[PDB]
Ligand SMILES: O=C1C[C@@H](C(=O)O)NC(=O)N1
Ligand SMILES: O=C1C[C@@H](C(=O)O)NC(=O)N1
Ligand SMILES: [Zn+2]
């Protein structure tokens with residue numbers, strides 16, 4: 213068929229596990245998974261080992277990413293029980309601040325949330341892992357401190373309808389939804405098993421999944437929440453939560469597009485334009501993705517690149533394939549082969565156009 | 574000594590267990606405990622059996638109270654998973670609506686909270702059991718629906734500082750604190766035991782208790798959260814949470830007054846004026862309480878009137894004693910003897926001055 217050209221897509225929620233969890237994934241394998249999924253820019257979460265909750269850990273993570281990343285990236289800082297008010301000099305160099313309100317870096321009191329909202333620079337992003345009533349609680353803190361907040365992986369009818377009500381009142385809140393909460397449900401827990409199927413937020417009911425689709429207008433971004441764990445860990449005694457998702461996100465969503473569940477533009481708003489404008493991420497010159505919307509295939513037991521080496525979407529039929537990715541003028545991916553080496557990717561916050569504009573302080 | 578005359582005090586948070594739990598307490602014994610504590614008006618919570626979540630249950634509870642109460646009263650309605658939008662004709666006859674966000678009547682989703690805030694008459698009280706981040710979540714719902722909310726039994730530094738921040742922004746929120754969260758702490762769990770010491774909100778740290786005192790200006794009301802359970806239940810296999818408190822609240826607070834921890838006026842604001850104005854409760858004619866602030870005594874293993882027949886304040890030294898209570902021109906209590914019979918008390922919402930003023934609908 214004739215290929216469809218897309219801009220370089222952005223995933224604002226990936227866990228690349230480097231430093232400290234490199235058997236699950238590292239920058240080189242995670243960004244290869246990204247490129248294979250049509251993603252040319254990722255925002256990596258801070259719950260690594262050591263966690264990115266201070267300047268030295270950020271300095272280390274930056275060098276590991278610059279040395280191992282194959283696509284471009286930005287790095288989140290994590291809010292901790294100790295670092296409120298201490299991140300002012302490095303905050304602008306990060307993708308944003310992740311507030312983990314379920315990895316929590318010791319944050320346990322709403323008063324600590326307030327301190328972070330008061331001290332983190334007001335022009336820079338804050339994203340929150342907040343489930344069920346926690347969405348309401350963190351929105352309240354955002355209002356008290358009169359600033360915006362971005363809600364990670366919305367998974368429930370309860371949560372999306374709450375955000376819907378907040379937007380109707382004109383509040384500055386945006387949100388993202390991950391593909392497993394659009395394409396998997398309780399109906400899949402029998403096949404997956406209790407170990408494999410462990411994820412946070414957990415899989416929703418059919419009614420939850422139906423509510424997210426019905427309220428697509430409320431969803432600002434799609435993001436994978438790529439959370440790689442080995443099969444041994446997912447099936448073991450204390451299964452960690454999370455799915456790998458970089459290599460399956462776009463095929464799943466392209467399938468929905470070909471079925472008329474959302475438009476191609478609807479998809480590009482949520483994987484390109486809205487991530488750009490929420491996180492102030494720069495364009496990528498000479499960067500685009502070529503996909504084939506006619507190719508039907510079945511998702512295998514594991515995708516080629518993620519070290520997780522498993523996938524909960526196994527056996528699902530998809531229509532849509534990433535055929536070629538060009539990143540800043542170089543062929544990065546073609547028909548299953550990655551052609552840019554570790555270290556090709558760059559930190560977008562170091563580009564002149566990647567700094568977040570602010571009033572002169 | 575010369576006795577100090579106080580107005581008739583109000584406890585806006587009591588569990589009187591009738592109907593359905595009359596071995597723990599009934600209207601006659603609970604209101605005798607109230608009168609012995611200097612309390613002439615109580616607001617009874619709806620988590621009885623059957624719970625007061627519909628008009629027939631309210632009609633039954635009203636008659637049981639009118640037949641058994643020795644002091645005056647109002648009855649809460651409970652928010653349920655089914656009764657949002659169905660309480661319009663009886664709402665004005667209730668003390669208010671209790672939202673139980675820990676007895677929960679099946680409410681589990683923030684969307685259900687919103688429905689109650691949208692449907693309950695906007696001029697009538699809503700109180701919420703909300704702990705830790707739930708305080709923030711329900712405040713958010715109050716703002717979305719642009720109305721006030723009253724937070725029950727604030728127990729933590731985290732909660733009182735959050736409410737403090739909300740009041741600084743001018744939000745319509747009030748709160749109450751119970752005596753066990755001012756006069757007991759973790760330091761008392763060894764003596765109490767894990768069964769006796771079970772209460773929700775649980776006992777706080779020294780730092781929690783210190784924060785509540787330091788932020789007394791943020792506390793609108795004192796209320797006992799009188800939650801009677803028999804000693805057998807408190808010490809048994811599945812201990813229910815709660816303390817009896819009607820007979821000990823005022824002696825404990827009068828002790829703090831004599832120690833200069835708060836003024837007598839500070840006390841009367843929180844046990845008389847602010848309860849009046851938050852819940853639109855009418856004055857009680859020819860009603861007053863005479864106390865002796867010099868009499869020192871030690872709290873015994875159980876107080877005379879509550880069927881709970883135990884108390885977690887056992888062994889605490891207090892200075893201050895209720896000597897006499899007059900209710901609507903009749904001696905109701907004198908030196909340990911109750912002299913008004915069951916049925917003397919009335920439903921204050923049926924008085925002309927006890928209806929909540931509203932714009933003509
Ligand atoms: O909150 C999270 C984080 C993630 C991980 O494993 O890092 N995977 C999950 O399923 N939930
Ligand atoms: O929420 C509550 C309710 C009360 C009861 O037993 O009814 N006692 C408590 O300790 N917490
Ligand atoms: Zn995540």
Ligand SMILES: [Zn+2]
Nearest residue numbers: 586588618798
């Ligand atoms: Zn209560």
